[PDB]
Each structure stands twice: as structure tokens, then as C-alpha cells.
Design a protein around this ligand. Structure first.
Ligand SMILES: CC(=O)N[C@H]1[C@H]([C@H](O)[C@H](O)CO)O[C@@](O[C@H]2[C@@H](O)[C@@H](CO)O[C@@H](O)[C@@H]2F)(C(=O)O)C[C@@H]1O
Ligand SMILES: [Cl-]
Length: 231
């Protein structure tokens, strides 16, 4: 068991999308008659004139290997933030079903189960200061070694790259959505906030008593074990 996000919200969205595709197939929608391996949930633009980010059930066979670059697809972390995932929408040829309401509801429900209150606090600090940003302890511009707590514009993160985030005990954890420390323009889109983010994390009340040891888990609540006596 790794100290890492299980990406449980994304898993649930993919499974729900697999069920929806199967239901559309039964309704006669031929292009939705596929094995489950072909269907994922992504938050993205759609076909032409579908220009808002919405939760949609995509056939992966219709996705483009690259985006360029307003047509990227986004996956979701376990605190419900959308982050760039591999691939792009084909604006003419996409095979998808927009299901924004049900998929958004599943995200909201999942956040309660899976989002570390310590991470939620760090994310809130960042969004309050820099709207749209989330917290990670990760790389900056043109330095692929140094990590620091920063408020990152979500578009600058990579879902396939894990980066440090706060566990539900306020201890080291790793979450999808990280930086490579490359030197692209996107690599600039962050605001380093060591003091403010650490304070946000430090301000969270423990799920355990002062007489218990917090052992973090990939779901809330963490384990609170009775502290060992002067045995
Ligand atoms: C340009 C951008 O979107 N973000 C840059 C930010 C940003 O301008 C400031 O954080 C706004 O207050 O600055 C970065 O560089 C920082 C950083 O090196 C810190 C270390 O604490 O020291 C400051 O003097 C630098 F401006 C940042 O926050 O990382 C670079 C971002 O691209
Ligand atoms: Cl996560």
C-alpha cells in the first residue's frame, strides 16, 4: 500500500460512464456499443459549439493523442479538481455523451469520502488567493529537482505525474497532478506560497485525539490508534 491517492473519484466516474454507454447502446446508439475498456469520463470541451468544460463519457478510440491546446481532456483528483490527462478531443469526430449532472454529483459525493481535510485546507487557501489554483509540493519553472508548496493553475499540471500533497493526517502523501520542472510557458503558471500553505495545513484540527496516533489512509477517516503507554 503506497502513500498515494487511489484516484477513487475518477474510477467511479469511468464505471458510471461505462454503464451509461451500455444503456445508450440498448437505446440503439450503435457507436456506444463497446467494451468497458473503450469508455472513460473526462472533463472537456465537446464537438464544435460545445465549448464549455463539461463531464462527458468518451470513447477513447475517438480521442486525439495530443491536444493543441484548448481541446485537452481533464481527469479529476480525489478532492474534485480537474487536471489535464493524456489526450485531446477531436472537435468534429468525437464519440461522447455529455453527462454533466450525474458525473458532477458523483464528484461531490466522492470529495466527502476521499478528500483529505488537510489538502482541502491547502486547496482553499490557494483558491482564495489565486482563483482556480490547487496546492501541491512540486517543481517550478525550469528546475526538475526543487519542490515547494505552490498554488498551481490546474492547466499547468499533469495528471499522470504524482506530486506531494497532504494526507488525512497532515503527513507526506502523493496525488495525481504534478509538474516535470520543464521550461515551457505552462511551467510558469503557479504561485509559490510556502508559509501560507503550511499555515493552512497546520490550522486543520486532527481527526484523532491528543492521546491517539494518526495513521493516514486513502479514504476518510484515517486510523486513530491509542497511543502506546509508558509500558
Ligand atoms: C508568473 C506567474 O504566474 N507566477 C510566477 C510567480 C508569481 O509572479 C508570484 O508568486 C506572484 O506573487 O512567482 C514565481 O517566482 C517567485 C518564487 O521564486 C518565490 C519563492 O518563494 O520568490 C519570488 O520572489 C518569485 F517571484 C513563483 O511564485 O514561483 C514564479 C511564477 O512563475
Ligand atoms: Cl488526489
Amino acid at each position: 500500500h503506497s502513500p498515494a491517492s487511489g484516484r477513487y473519484i475518477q474510477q467511479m466516474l469511468d464505471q458510471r460512464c461505462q454503464e451509461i454507454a451500455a444503456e445508450l447502446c440498448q437505446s440503439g446508439l450503435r457507436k456506444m456499443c463497446v467494451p468497458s475498456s473503450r469508455i472513460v469520463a473526462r472533463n472537456a470541451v465537446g464537438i464544435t459549439h460545445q465549448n464549455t468544460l463539461q463531464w462527458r463519457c468518451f470513447d477513447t478510440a475517438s480521442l486525439l493523442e495530443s491536444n493543441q491546446e484548448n481541446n485537452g481532456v481533464n481527469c479529476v483528483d480525489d478532492c474534485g479538481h480537474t487536471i489535464p490527462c493524456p489526450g485531446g478531443v477531436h472537435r468534429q469526430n468525437s464519440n461522447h455523451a455529455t453527462r454533466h449532472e450525474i458525473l458532477s454529483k458523483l464528484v461531490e459525493e466522492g470529495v466527502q469520502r476521499f478528500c483529505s481535510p488537510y489538502q482541502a485546507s491547502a486547496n482553499k487557501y490557494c483558491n482564495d488567493k489565486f482563483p482556480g489554483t490547487i496546492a501541491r509540493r512540486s517543481k517550478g519553472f525550469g528546475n526538475n529537482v526543487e519542490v515547494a508548496w505552490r498554488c498551481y493553475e490546474k492547466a499547468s499540471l499533469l495528471y499522470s505525474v504524482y506530486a506531494e500533497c497532504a494526507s488525512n493526517c497532515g503527513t507526506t502523501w502523493y496525488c495525481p497532478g504534478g509538474r516535470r520542472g520543464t521550461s515551457t510557458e505552462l511551467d510558469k503558471r503557479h504561485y509559490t506560497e510556502e508559509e501560507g500553505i503550511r499555515q493552512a495545513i497546520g490550522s486543520v484540527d486532527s481527526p484523532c485525539s491528543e492521546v491517539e496516533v494518526c495513521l493516514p489512509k486513502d479514504e476518510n477517516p484515517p486510523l486513530c490508534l491509542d497511543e502506546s503507554g509508558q509500558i
